[model samples]
Target: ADDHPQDKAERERIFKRFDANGDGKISAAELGEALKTLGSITPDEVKHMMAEIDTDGDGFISFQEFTDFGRANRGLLKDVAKIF
Candidate 1:
């Protein structure tokens, strides 16, 4: 239920990359834009990804939200970083 220390660090690094504006949060627009760089990702898929990860219904992903998702889908995190 918790990330290992190394995993947490890697997640933080990836989270920072996603938070393009450096506001400590990742808006849906930011997520979508980042995914676009990965190619072949549709808006619907981005919306679905946000729906799954935005647990607090805040319309943005805080570091906590990302790391929580990362804990469950570690491989996904690796692909996510490739966008950068």
Candidate 2:
């Protein structure tokens, strides 16, 4: 019911890039790399942010979790909106 074609497509495209290794999941290192593309971000900061975004306690982010976090925290994503 929450489907938005363009939104989904965009998120998937972004997710693919974030999933650097093509492993279908984003690791802390990958997330750090993505954040660094925006500006200087520390490993501690990345790990802290990842802890929250990683909802299922899996220690990695799947596309589903990524989108879900985006939907809920639009402002956070907006802060890095230039990337997408």
Candidate 3:
């Protein structure tokens, strides 16, 4: 992660948009809604996405989890919308 400001902003926007409850975390249900915005996705797909991204097993994407994801996937800087 070279700290691209635009990418960082985009990532933050993605997390915040999905965090509909304003709880600073992305719940499973919120993730489903986010994924749905990109295209059709199944419960299984959402569950699988959560399993991989929720590194702490807390059943949600904390700010740290979101940051880690952004850091790890630098190549997808411009396509974060698809990555989500």
Candidate 4:
């Protein structure tokens, strides 16, 4: 787990917002939808974004994976504009 226990709450809030459907996991489609809400992102862009975060390649992002994404990507959480 790349997530620091200290940042758990903050990460959880961000991840939970994107999870949608009340499921603990986030599918690429869900991620694409959320990203589209943020701005104009294309299908290929969405696919690449998912590929960036979905390291396990399960076609879904668990909460742990989401937090790991934040750590690895950096700046993304801080630049989450319009993605509330």
Per-residue error (Å), model 3, residue 77: 5.9
In candidate 3, which residue ranges exceed 4 Å CA deviation? 4-6, 80-84
Q: Tell me the tens digit of each residue's lDDT in model 3 across 49-79.
A: 7788899888998767877876777565346
Task: Name the weakest run of 10 consecutive residues (lDDT summed) in model 2.
Answer: 75-84
| Candidates ranked by lDDT | 1, 2, 4, 3
Least lDDT summed over 10 consecutive residues: which range in candidate 3?
74-83
TM-score of each: 0.84, 0.84, 0.78, 0.79
Specify the highest-lDDT model's number: 1
Q: Which pairs in model 3 have colliding backbones?
A: none
**Best-to-worst ranking by TM-score:** 1, 2, 4, 3
Off by over 4 Å in 2: 1-3, 79-81
Compose the digit string of candidate 4's lDDT tens values, residues 4-53.
67677777777777787958888777777777776667879878877888
TM-score, model 3 to reference: 0.78
After TM-score superposition, the amount by which residue 61's alpha carbon in candidate 3 deviates from its true location, in angstroms, is 0.4
Please, what are the lDDT tens digits per residue for candidate 2 over residues 1-84?
776687777677777878889787898899888878867669899888779989987889999999999889766666665675
Candidate 2 is scored at a TM of 0.84
